[model samples]
Target: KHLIVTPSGAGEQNMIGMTPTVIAVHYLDETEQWEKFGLEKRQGALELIKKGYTQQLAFRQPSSAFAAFVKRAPSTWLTAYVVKVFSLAVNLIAIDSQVLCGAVKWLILEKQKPDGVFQEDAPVIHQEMIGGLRNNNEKDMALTAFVLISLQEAKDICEEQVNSLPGSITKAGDFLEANYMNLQRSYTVAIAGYALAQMGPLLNKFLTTAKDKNRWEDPGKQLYNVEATSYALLALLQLKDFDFVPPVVRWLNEQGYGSTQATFMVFQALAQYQKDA
Candidate 1:
């Protein structure tokens, strides 16, 4: 009964907490009694932290929460990494950053070959798992883009440490360009476009391509997917490109306010463009 109704109200519940708790109980036997009761007390706490309920408290507040969660399930690398990232976001340094950084750095380093392309024998990674076998799949594109974007963002916090890692932002840009396909029938291009736009000059190229092409997808599709388009437009705006705003505006007009995601995108775009103008 719990399992059936569990995921039904998922989106409404605190997804971040729910995910970590589920991983903990399933992979580790630390909280057997609590797991049986389906209390999810830790998840409730995390949701509070995310909502800024603990903002005034000492960093130990969230750090202790993450430490407890990680101690209950040490073997789950993905969960540990997420908890560490969230902990860092909340300025909680109780858990070892070295552990999380080492795992991600090792995975990234091990995957890249001498030629600078990531290869995997099995689809253990999320992108490979989602995108499947195509060497240059869109899923991989999105995943790779996200990884680079995240690392780049992290550079702001851990400048010297993260900067020492391999693959400069330029290399990421080069990879995206090498794998780009203008008329290709995949959501990957949009992902690549967004990644490239993070770097300024490459963003100009992306905007030019979008303006000249008039549509993001192949012939079978009509208009753009709001989610994909939003990312693309946001990427362009990040580089201060206002020329593409009209098309996004028209797209929003057609969509009305029916799409929550699209509406957010439009509001964000308008704010950025207005500020720039």
Candidate 2:
């Protein structure tokens, strides 16, 4: 009667798997979306994710960054993603501030560029999940947006633990403001829009550009497009910019769902929209 999709494959094995799954489980349970599925599978999934987080912790490097696999170099993107998930899931599980801040330090000291943009050192297998950053002419606009979003969440989770968070966010926020107009991709604009909204008057430019494209409306079942639209939704919802959100929310709902990436994003955006309403 109901299905709960968790990630599969090597990359999905730990951080990626547990983060989204645990988030979805807890979120669904809170919203009563788990009613039909019963609490049995929900509890079972939590056990799996808890163990998964522990295994991923073992892969953390001495510097606190995480690699796509054990014994490899740490990845900026993966580490940032892990920080975001752990912080967001703090309510559902016990999160270690020490462990969280270790990676935050690494991200701030090692990965962030002099100009404040974030780039990935190691290759990410699931490139499509961040399709906005790939094949783009500009460098790391989407990546920086994603990382900034993560870092912001981590800051809220442990502000006192990371003294560098404020300065880092300020620099990155400036970088985005100075470079946002150069962004041409819908996805980049959408993500940058959301990230910057948390930090701007520049949001109007992003909003206008996104509105020009009609917010990628009725983007069909394409995962990237849906994900892009969802990010736009998140940005608008964050700013409480509600003029055009209804049509997009309607389009997203009609699309049913897609991959784990798109589904999670859609659910997150919808949840935020509900809260805003």
lDDT of each: 0.41, 0.71
Using TM-score as the measure, the top candidate is 2
Error of 2 at 99 (Å): 1.5
**Tens-digit lDDT track of model 2 for 1-277:** 2233343444334555564576577557556776776756777776666777777777778889887666777778778877876777677667788989999888988888898988788856665444445545555787788889888888877688888888889989888888888866667777777888886456666666654445553233367667778878888887787887888888888772225456556667877787776
Estimate, for each residue in 1-277, the C-alpha lDDT of model 1 and write its tens digit: 1211121111112222323333332222232344564566545434443443122112122222211122232112222223323333433223345433543454355544443333333322232111111234354455455455445445444344544344645655567677665325334555467667766454455555553443343332233344445556656567665666667646644652123223333344444444545
TM-score of each: 0.50, 0.87
- Model 2 regions lying over 4 Å from their true place: 1-12, 129-131, 211-214, 217-221, 256-260
Q: For model 2, where is the 10-residue window of minimal lDDT?
A: 1-10
Q: After superposition, how far is residue 136 of candidate 2 from its true place, in Å?
A: 3.9
